[PDB]
């Protein structure tokens, strides 16, 4: 009946404790053996390794490699699972959501907070949840973690130790899995194929992400643009503004918004940015700063890199960023 | 019996909806009137305004002004309440925790997610919780929000809309308030005066905070040091490392850690950083990067600014950052 491809990339799920600390050492065949994963029963699992990478530290070039491999596999597989490091899982899931347009199959990313060989490892549970969801007659890019299925472009890693490490940010979970029971939280009907798969791996990697902090000077904006960076993401305040008083930050940004996309997201985790609610937000908007609305940091960053691969025109970037491609952002 | 000082600074709690959006318009007398706050019954509340500031957008100079005003008030008051904007509440609470050593009285910061004049405003509830805790025979810097009392140097704003907007990060709450009932979560005995109050407002404001993202180049480190910044905070990965492969970020940091403190915190909210667990973390540590351990971003940033006001020696900064002054960091 079904054919699944499991793609290994390294990560904690591929790691073992050594004298040098945790080290990515396992190929996908060893992961599946050590996590006691069934390779058959109404399906056949095939496996493969993305060579010379470790998704403990994913590089954007790896996104292009993974996107090309996943896109080729769509022909030959009913479902695709990617095992990946947790720290950038959400970035890969988000970038794949923009690089693979209208996947006609489930692409499910997972990892583990614990190596397989550590006591109470989450790796077997998460691989099994990913396999169960990849066998569903659905399409899109998802993350399987701690029995949840989440839209990939809505996931963030919220903690560094706890097993419930991934959350859907400002968006419902897709589903919850209890064994052979899949409970759809958004209707299965909303994840059906709709148009033909397209591969688009264009991107500009020089996006810099700053936390907005009290006293942060406009000198930092001069510095990153002199370092030749092409987009700026600000982890800003809920009011969505920047100071005019005792500060050149807003005035130095207003000078460069005609030529450089400056995106306002939040340092806070939940509920997004609304630059209209406060006078300070409206002042920021009137400088040509682009609101990230309800997007994750991971979606904002990957989307802008992808957007800048297409155009240097800031109005076109503004339109791309506010286009809802795959439910990464509210309409 | 008791004397309390309520200090107004602006913020959402001082704001009203205008045609220009929310605007900070209310002095503390109007806040207390509009939130129907009792000014007596076993206490007397006096009030005052920090002039020519709006804590919607706090500036570090305002920290020095507030610290000096609060420190003077310790003589004449049993308790001190500061009403403040929510977006930088946690930064002011953390910086006051370093600038006012051994306060011999409760200093309680609060604000509101809603203006007083909006339906279902949290402002009255939060002011009342702050007053109840400021009447306790305790000492320290606390935040009152949504019936919780939290250690100031452990608070972060976690969301932009929800009323339960502040959390104690990697540390228990101090107390929970149900009316005239205060339930201590950490024993009241642990917040007693211990040595004489000292004021220390030295700080260096040029700290820049970067999110670690895939492909972020060492060119950004050259840029911020050429802009004359004196400390770098990295919102890094749970594994606590930075790439050597297809990257000069770690190698460019290793060049400047002898002269510039580079602090590793997390982009994730909960559970802190452990640079020993992974080989990639140990490689980062061996470059002279300073771990923030379990500290909030708000404590890390304010502590480093305060640390850099005292010394330019990176070993002395490393020792200051890992000194547990007021339970901002694990020992």
Residue numbers in the entry:
A (entry chain A), B (entry chain A): 1 to 331
Quote the study on this structure.
The hyperthermophilic L-ASNase from Thermococcus sibiricus (TsAI) was previously shown to exhibit high activity and thermostability and is promising for biotechnology. L-ASNase exerts its anticancer activity by hydrolyzing L-asparagine (L-Asn) in the bloodstream to L-aspartic acid and ammonia. The subunit of TsAI consists of two α/β domains: an N-terminal large domain (residues 1–184, consisting of twelve mixed β-sheets and four α-helices) and a C-terminal small domain (residues 207–331, consisting of three β-sheets and five α-helices) connected by an interdomain linker (residues 185–206). In the N-terminal domain, the active site pocket of TsAI includes residuesthat are highly conserved among all types of L-ASNases: Y22, S55, T56, T86, D87, K157, and T12, which initiates the reaction.
The crystal structure of TsAI was solved at 1.9 Å. The asymmetric unit contained one copy of the protein. Crystal contact analysis showed that TsAI is a dimer in crystal as in solution. In the TsAI structure, T56 forms a water-mediated hydrogen bond with S15. The side chain of D54 forms a hydrogen bond network with G11, S55, and T56. The position of this loop is additionally fixed by the interaction of the side chain S55 with T9 and G85. The network of hydrogen bonds formed between D54 and G11, S55, and T56, along with the interaction of the side chain of S55 with T9 and G85, was shown to restrict loop motion in the wild-type enzyme. Thus, the higher rigidity of the loop M51-L57 is significant for maintaining increased thermostability of the native thermo-ASNase TsAI. In the wild-type enzyme, adaptive mutations stabilized the loop by a network of H-bonds and replaced the highly thermolabile glutamine residue with threonine to ensure proper function at elevated temperatures. Structural superposition of TsAI with TkA, PhA, PfA, EcAI, and EcAII (RMSD between TsAI and these structures are 0.5 Å, 0.6 Å, 0.5 Å, 1.5 Å, and 1.5 Å, respectively) revealed high conservation of the active site architecture and similarity in overall topology of non-catalytic regions, regardless of type, origin (taxonomy), and degree of sequence identity.
